[PDB]
Every structure is written in structure tokens, then in C-alpha cells.
Amino acid sequence: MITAQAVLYTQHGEPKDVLFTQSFEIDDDNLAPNEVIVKTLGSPVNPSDINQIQGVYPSKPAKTTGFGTTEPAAPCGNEGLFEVIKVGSNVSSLEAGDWVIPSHVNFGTWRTHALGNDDDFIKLPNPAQSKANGKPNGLTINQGATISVNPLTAYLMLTHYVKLTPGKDWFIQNGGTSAVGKYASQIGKLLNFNSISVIRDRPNLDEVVASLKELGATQVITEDQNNSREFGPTIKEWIKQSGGEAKLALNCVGGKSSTGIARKLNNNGLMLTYGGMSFQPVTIPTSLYIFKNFTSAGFWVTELLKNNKELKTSTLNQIIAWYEEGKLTDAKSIETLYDGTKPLHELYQDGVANSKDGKQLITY
Amino acid sequence: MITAQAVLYTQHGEPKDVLFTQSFEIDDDNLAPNEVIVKTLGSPVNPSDINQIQGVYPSKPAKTTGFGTTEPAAPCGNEGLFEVIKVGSNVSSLEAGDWVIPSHVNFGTWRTHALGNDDDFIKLPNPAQSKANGKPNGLTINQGATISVNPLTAYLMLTHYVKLTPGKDWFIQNGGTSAVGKYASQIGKLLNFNSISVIRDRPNLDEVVASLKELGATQVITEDQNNSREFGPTIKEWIKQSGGEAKLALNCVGGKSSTGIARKLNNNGLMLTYGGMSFQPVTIPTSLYIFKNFTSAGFWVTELLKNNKELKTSTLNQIIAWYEEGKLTDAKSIETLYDGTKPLHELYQDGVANSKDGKQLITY
Ligand SMILES: NC(=O)C1=CN([C@@H]2O[C@H](COP(=O)(O)OP(=O)(O)OC[C@H]3O[C@@H](n4cnc5c(N)ncnc54)[C@H](OP(=O)(O)O)[C@@H]3O)[C@@H](O)[C@H]2O)C=CC1
Ligand SMILES: NC(=O)C1=CN([C@@H]2O[C@H](COP(=O)(O)OP(=O)(O)OC[C@H]3O[C@@H](n4cnc5c(N)ncnc54)[C@H](OP(=O)(O)O)[C@@H]3O)[C@@H](O)[C@H]2O)C=CC1
């Protein structure tokens, strides 16, 4: 018998108000033939996990009395890395010690353990296996725990919609310091796409600029430069002088920022909106649509991959391979370790409240 | 010799400030083998004509001294109907008496006559020719003079981007009382497409609503209803009962109106922005792109048909056919006849100033 903790809520609302920790037992001596028990190694706090709890995200786990609560309650978190503890008698896809991530969204990853079917998980090579397979590197906890959402988002947005000619074409993105932005920059470098990252100004601008260029951004500008009429021609020269064109814009901010990157694209440009950190709508001048044949669309990784395991697998394997080859690094996280001295849900409420400091990862 | 008049400007500005009339001569006796002389029957004042003169429209006539001015001057007007008066010794495509429209934009239609090559024009059937073919109707001056821009814009937006299932699917459009909106309603009913027209409220609402439904709108709502969450379910019920889906939105207003019509589309919807009469940008909530997979694109008939004679020809023929059969009616115009007593340019300046009254057509 295993005693586990799960972060739940009986009703939607702000994480700071509705989350709680529910103690529950998992019978490791009576697993159905296809069941598996996993122990969480780490799971992050992503904006979508929060919106899901708030009730403003159209994809969520059902509320049930399954964890032993009197009222129906839903679990939290959609991605994370777990270590397999035990498999049922008919399980062959997984075994003790394996590293896995949920095979689908809405599994609930903010907890110490989980009981599920073998098909509820996807196996990632763990360090022991990467070494035995002769790979140069093995995944870290954070890399495994954040491999499902942000890296695939960056990869698919950059390759699934418009073909950028290697060594010539460009994509421009705001939210340059975001985890997704950092993954996009690297993938751009790996695929040989040029790129402009737009970020908010800061006292350590120079340091962040060099850091993002190391990751792979060709040029880094501030939102003030993004808004500047006078600076505009300098950006256009970068594109024109490269021989390619700015064909794609990645927007996760909205507002003025989204207007600014759209204006930087060449005619027939495409913008993918995948986030709205400013809480401002996407505003595009009528002229961009008519005279520059601009197109504005959306991206939702959860929806793109829910019934396309093939595209998901192919994308995931590429990220894993780059991690094993030492060609990709992770958007780093501020890790908070659960040790039982502080209720689990509080560690997540803190991670939520401290999101502004950067990606939060609760570890176990 | 023929003494002609042309409305010109030597510098971009407001029509009321920079326009003037230039008298020039055409030698109807010295025609090159492939030249043609035509006299204008009528030409409209369209928003794009004005934007062109203002210098905020990226497609324009080269300034030249061809009309006998010392400083380079540009002509005005992009569409219109002309009657062929004389053709060169090598012209077989046109005969005296034929009706033609410019074959390309930027020809300058705000003038009494024009000398050009045969390939500078596209023949339309004149009344006698339509009649000799047993067609119920011949084209009127206004129908011929306004056939190049608004009707083709409406047709191509409804048929060239997303396929609406006849008898089922819907398109929604703002700017319902505009000439384009009136063509879209008619083309919509002729192709058996369902549609909702959005217009600004007015005291004679009932009459305008009835009028738009006769033209082809299935339903007509005000912008207030467009802004209404309360009203939302009513629209959704209309679509549900039809068994179809709202797949396309036509936007020529911008601002809140563009937001409102975008929201009423079913998931995977497409909006075509082709105008922005409110002078407000297209604003779309982040959630529509991500969760509803909405797409916002542009439309510019000038750019689309620029190097696509076949698509232009085909679309033009379908409009001519509907006029000849009597199935399509023109967005009516307020006509001002030039008789040589008031400078030609003033007639057009009045046309520009009285735009809000409705489509203006200067006749000859
Ligand atoms: N649609 C999809 O499939 C996916 C969408 N997303 C979206 O991406 C965003 C989260 O990304 P990750 O999860 O990569 O994010 P992180 O939490 O790592 O980064 C968030 C970023 O947003 C920036 N930011 C915060 N507030 C503002 C503001 N007011 N104006 C401009 N920028 C601001 C931060 O700036 P700074 O560095 O200056 O502090 C930081 O760069 C969310 O919008 C999330 O919902 C993520 C994955 C997938
Ligand atoms: N290829 C392209 O991209 C093309 C673009 N256009 C664009 O379409 C529009 C012109 O259309 P046509 O040439 O059909 O126009 P008209 O001038 O004939 O009609 C314009 C109509 O728009 C309405 N209108 C004016 N201001 C507003 C507002 N703020 N909100 C809602 N309605 C408003 C009027 O309403 P009411 O009568 O009720 O007062 C009027 O019925 C312009 O935006 C023009 O540039 C046209 C052809 C092609």
C-alpha cells in the first residue's frame, strides 16, 4: 500500500484559493493486468495549467470522488516526468525504473504518485538507458518534465505551417525570454533559420541579448525597438540583406507587440498566435491584411496532437534525439523540492504566484 | 482632333485640395496600327480611388507629362465604362461602338477620353450585342462602369477561399449596406449561400432590413446585436437549424464590428478583411485563434487579378451573365453628368465629398 498526495479542487477559481492536498492510498499489491504505478519525479507549472484550474481553458479533467473526497474533485497539471514503480502482469511496454510522461493531457501531474494504464504513458529513455545505448547525454529531470508542451510547441509552429528556406528565411517572435521562445531560438539555430526575438527591456539587457543569441536568435530587439518607426528600416535591412524573407511571426504576447511583429513580415506573411501574456487582444492594422496579404492564425498544441499520435511521436523523438546528442538545452526552471514538511498544494500555489520569476518546477 | 479633359494631381493630397482639370488633345487621324480611341460613358468614385489620390494606397499611376502638363501629373479613377470610337488599322478585337472597361488598374478613368492600345481594354457586350444574342437584358452604364471592382470582390471572396455547402453553410458580413455588401448578398442568394448582414441601427431599420433580405441576406442584425452576448444564442440557433456552419466572415469595417462577426463563426472559421471604414484595426481575442482555431486573412482584388487574366475573365463573365439574364441588380449610383459647364474635377470632388450619400457615378 502506498500513501500518495494529490493537488485537487472541487470547483474552479484562482489556484491561490481553490487548491488543496488530498492524501490517498494506492494498492500496489493488486494492480489490474494492464495497470502501472508511477512516482512523480517532477512536474511544472505552466500558464495553461493555471487557466485550466481557473476554468477558462476548454480542456480539463473530469471531477470525481476517485481520490476519496466527499465532493467530486479534479486533479491538476498536464505534463510531468514520472518514474515507473510497478507494472501489472500483462504490461510489456513499461517496466520498473522507466521514465515516462503522460500520453495525453488532463492526467493530473501535480501529485506524488498515480495509478493508471500502461497506455496512459509514453516512455522516454532514462539516463541509464541512454548510456547503455551509447548516447553522449541523458535527459535531466527538468528536461523530461517539460518535454511535452513547450519544445513540441516551438518545433511544430516553426515546421508545420510555412516552409522556411534554410540559410535564408526568418521568423520573428515576441516573448523571446519565454521557455517556448528559448526553445524556438535553438530549434531555429538547429534548422538553420534566421530569427528575430523581441523582448521587454531590462537593466541587464546586454546579458540577456548575448544569452538569447547563444541559444540561437540571430537578432534580439526590445519592444521599444519593435514599436519604433525610426528603427524599422534597420530590421528590414537584416532581412533584405540575408537574401531571405520574414515569413513567420510567433506571438504569445498580444497587444501592441503582436502588431509590431506582424508589421515586420514580408508580404504573404503568417502569424501564429499561441499565447496572450499581456491579456490584450491581437490587433492588426487593416492595411497589413489588404496590401501585404498578411494572415493571422492560431496554434494549440493540445488540439493539434490529440488524434495524431504519429505527428506527436515524430516531434517528440526529434526533441529526445537532440537532447541525447547534446544539441538542445532546456529552458531552465526554478525548482522547489517536495519533502513532506510543507503541503504539496502550497508548493504549487507558490510556483503559481512566483511564475513571473520564470518557469517553476516542483520536484520530488 | 479631339479636345479632352482629364482630372489630375501633381502631388498626393485630399481630392478637394490637389485635383485639377487638364485639357488635352487626341489626334483621331493618326492612330497606330494597334491603337484605340474611346470616350468615357461613366466612371465611379470608389474609396480606393480616393486613397490612391491621398497617397496611402500602394498601387498607382505613374506621374507623367502625357496630358500636356509641364510637371509630372497622375490621372485618377481605376474603373469605368468607355465606348470605342476609332481603332487602328491592325485592331480586330474591337470595333467602333463597342463597350469596354480598362484591362488593368491605374489607367485613369476620371476623364472624357483615352487613347490606348487594344490590349489596354476588355470588351463587355453593349446593349445591341446582348439583344442580338436574345439575352433578356443589356448592361446599363452604371452596371458596366462599376463591374470591375465591387462585383468581382464580392464574388471572389465568397468562392475563392473556402467552399460553402449550398443550401446549408453561412457567411457573415459587416458593412451590409455598402455596394460590396449588396453584391455579396445577391451573389450569396444566387449561389444558395445563407448569410447574416450586419448594419448600423437607424430610424428606418425595418425598411433597410427588408431591402437587404430582398437582395439576398438571410438575416440582418445591427452592430448592437453583433456586440450582444444576450443575442448570441439566437444566431447560433439560426445556423443550427440550417444544418450548416458559419465558415466565412467578410470584414470591411474593422474595430468592434470585425471582432463581433469573427466570434459568430463556427470553429476553423475564416475571415477576409477587405476594407476598414471605421478606421479601427482588426482586433481579435487571443482565445479565438487558440481555442476556436480562427483565421484572419486579407483580400485585395487589385493584387489578386493583377497577373491572373483567366480568373478575372471567368469572374467577369459570370457577372455579365447574371446582368444579361436579369438575375443580378447593380448597387445603385447617384449620377452627376458632365456637360462642360462645371470643371470635370469639381464633379469628382463633389462625388468624393458626398460619398456618405452612397456610390457616386460621374456620367458623360
Ligand atoms: N497554445 C499552445 O499550444 C501553447 C501556448 N503557450 C503560451 O505561452 C505562454 C507561456 O510560455 P512558457 O510557458 O514558455 O512561459 P514562461 O512562463 O516561461 O514565459 C512567459 C513570458 O511572457 C513574458 N511576459 C509576462 N508578462 C508579459 C507582459 N505583460 N507583456 C509581455 N510579455 C510578458 C515574460 O517576460 P519576461 O521575460 O520579461 O519576464 C516571459 O518571456 C503563455 O501565453 C502560454 O499559455 C505555451 C505552450 C503552448
Ligand atoms: N479589394 C478590396 O480590398 C476592396 C475593398 N473595398 C473596400 O470596401 C469599402 C467601400 O465599399 P463600396 O466601395 O462597397 O462602399 P460604399 O461607399 O458604397 O459604401 C460604404 C458603406 O459603409 C458604411 N459605413 C461607413 N462607415 C461605417 C462604419 N463606421 N461602420 C459600418 N458601416 C460604415 C456605410 O453605411 P451606411 O450607408 O449605413 O451609413 C455605407 O453603406 C471600403 O472599405 C473600400 O476601400 C471595396 C472594393 C474592393
mmCIF file of C-alpha atoms in Angstrom, chain A residues 56-58 254 273-276 280-286 289-291 293-300, chain B residues 56-58 254 273-276 280-286 289-291 293-300:
data_model
loop_
_atom_site.group_PDB
_atom_site.id
_atom_site.type_symbol
_atom_site.label_atom_id
_atom_site.label_comp_id
_atom_site.label_asym_id
_atom_site.label_seq_id
_atom_site.Cartn_x
_atom_site.Cartn_y
_atom_site.Cartn_z
ATOM 1 C CA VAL A 56 -11.080 29.458 -18.615
ATOM 2 C CA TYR A 57 -9.331 26.672 -20.534
ATOM 3 C CA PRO A 58 -11.546 24.424 -22.751
ATOM 4 C CA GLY A 254 -0.838 40.101 -27.957
ATOM 5 C CA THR A 273 -0.816 33.284 -32.000
ATOM 6 C CA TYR A 274 -0.163 30.719 -29.255
ATOM 7 C CA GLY A 275 -0.364 32.843 -26.135
ATOM 8 C CA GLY A 276 -1.538 36.193 -24.817
ATOM 9 C CA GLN A 280 -4.519 42.328 -24.721
ATOM 10 C CA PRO A 281 -6.198 41.094 -27.940
ATOM 11 C CA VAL A 282 -4.331 40.640 -31.220
ATOM 12 C CA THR A 283 -4.564 43.957 -33.070
ATOM 13 C CA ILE A 284 -3.672 44.057 -36.746
ATOM 14 C CA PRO A 285 -3.925 47.201 -38.955
ATOM 15 C CA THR A 286 -6.396 46.692 -41.791
ATOM 16 C CA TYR A 289 -4.276 42.254 -44.442
ATOM 17 C CA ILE A 290 -5.104 44.069 -47.658
ATOM 18 C CA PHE A 291 -1.843 45.478 -49.053
ATOM 19 C CA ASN A 293 -1.666 39.917 -47.746
ATOM 20 C CA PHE A 294 -0.953 39.155 -44.098
ATOM 21 C CA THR A 295 -2.567 36.134 -42.399
ATOM 22 C CA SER A 296 -3.196 35.742 -38.666
ATOM 23 C CA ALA A 297 -3.923 32.256 -37.248
ATOM 24 C CA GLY A 298 -3.730 30.223 -34.075
ATOM 25 C CA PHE A 299 -1.789 27.349 -32.578
ATOM 26 C CA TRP A 300 -2.923 24.935 -29.852
ATOM 27 C CA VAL B 56 -1.999 55.991 -48.811
ATOM 28 C CA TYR B 57 -2.878 53.290 -51.386
ATOM 29 C CA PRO B 58 0.096 51.180 -52.648
ATOM 30 C CA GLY B 254 -12.701 46.916 -38.572
ATOM 31 C CA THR B 273 -10.664 41.707 -44.241
ATOM 32 C CA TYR B 274 -11.198 43.777 -47.396
ATOM 33 C CA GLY B 275 -11.924 47.242 -46.024
ATOM 34 C CA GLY B 276 -11.705 49.262 -42.813
ATOM 35 C CA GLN B 280 -10.080 50.983 -36.434
ATOM 36 C CA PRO B 281 -7.693 47.956 -36.588
ATOM 37 C CA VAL B 282 -8.843 44.359 -36.685
ATOM 38 C CA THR B 283 -8.939 43.210 -33.058
ATOM 39 C CA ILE B 284 -9.337 39.527 -32.276
ATOM 40 C CA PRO B 285 -9.255 37.954 -28.800
ATOM 41 C CA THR B 286 -6.339 35.594 -28.308
ATOM 42 C CA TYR B 289 -7.173 31.865 -32.554
ATOM 43 C CA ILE B 290 -6.043 29.303 -29.976
ATOM 44 C CA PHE B 291 -9.273 27.601 -28.840
ATOM 45 C CA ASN B 293 -8.727 27.875 -34.454
ATOM 46 C CA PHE B 294 -9.968 31.045 -36.154
ATOM 47 C CA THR B 295 -8.070 32.501 -39.139
ATOM 48 C CA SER B 296 -7.923 36.151 -40.136
ATOM 49 C CA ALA B 297 -6.736 36.912 -43.679
ATOM 50 C CA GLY B 298 -6.840 39.634 -46.292
ATOM 51 C CA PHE B 299 -8.391 40.325 -49.658
ATOM 52 C CA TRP B 300 -7.353 42.774 -52.386
#
